């Protein structure tokens, strides 16, 4: 037995059959998992996208996300896109809590983004809307640190997007880190930022 022992062994040339199939699943379950896990973000995102010219991005795990810009590894964070409506400007928002450039480690920089979202095409270009950038405190009234600024249509951050996102255009200078952490701006270890796109006087139906 060694010629037909392989006959009995043909049943072993079966192992690789069950095997090779199972492979097709760890693949899928993974791809699916990466997808399931993927559907989560999108579902955690669809729930938190403002539709009326304003934003309130809630930042937590703070002392975790500072030691990322401070010990360089996870510098900037972004909010969620917030539109003027459902089919318009996909204005995102990124935070440089430690800072970037002329306010890096001596200030907390926060800027206003503008994204490319289908309905850029039909909507008036270039961006030309007021954008009040403020900081929300958890405590009492607590002054809402931040300002706006009128878009200088010549700014290369207000064009009609051509790539996934735009050129930031906020303030590398916002709140001296020595004031942000010198308050309650980080209650329960969490901060909040309010964005305001002065839509006020705009052509309406």
């Amino acid at each position: 037995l060694e010629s037909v022992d392989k006959s009995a062994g043909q049943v072993a040339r079966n192992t690789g059959l069950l095997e090779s199939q199972l492979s097709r699943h760890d693949q899928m379950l993974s791809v699916h998992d990466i997808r399931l896990a993927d559907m989560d973000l999108r579902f955690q995102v669809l729930e938190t996208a403002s539709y009326n010219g304003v934003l309130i991005w809630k930042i937590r795990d703070y002392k975790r996300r500072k030691q990322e810009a401070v010990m360089g590894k996870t510098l900037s964070l972004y909010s969620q896109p917030f539109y003027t409506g459902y089919f318009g400007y996909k204005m995102c928002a990124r935070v440089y809590l430690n800072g970037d450039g002329m306010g890096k480690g001596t200030h907390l920089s926060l800027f206003f983004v503008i994204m490319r979202g289908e309905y850029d095409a039909l909507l008036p270009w270039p961006f030309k809307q007021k954008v009040t950038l403020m900081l929300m405190d958890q405590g009492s009234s607590r002054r809402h640190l931040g300002d706006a600024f009128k878009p200088d249509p010549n700014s290369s951050s207000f064009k009609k997007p051509t790539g996934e996102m735009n050129i930031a255009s906020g303030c590398p200078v916002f709140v001296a880190q020595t004031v942000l952490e010198n308050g309650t701006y980080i209650k329960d270890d969490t901060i909040f930022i309010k964005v305001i796109v002065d839509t006020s006087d705009l052509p309406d139906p």
């Binding site: 440089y96 450039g101 878009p151 200088d152 700014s155 050129i167 930031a168 255009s169």
Partner: peptide, 21 residues
């Protein structure tokens, strides 16, 4: 008669810090 703010630079490929002066 609007407002003159800051723009940014434009990313590259190599190591370096987010700068635009």
């Amino acid at each position: 008669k609007t407002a003159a703010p800051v723009q940014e630079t434009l990313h590259g490929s190599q190591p370096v810090t987010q700068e635009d002066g």
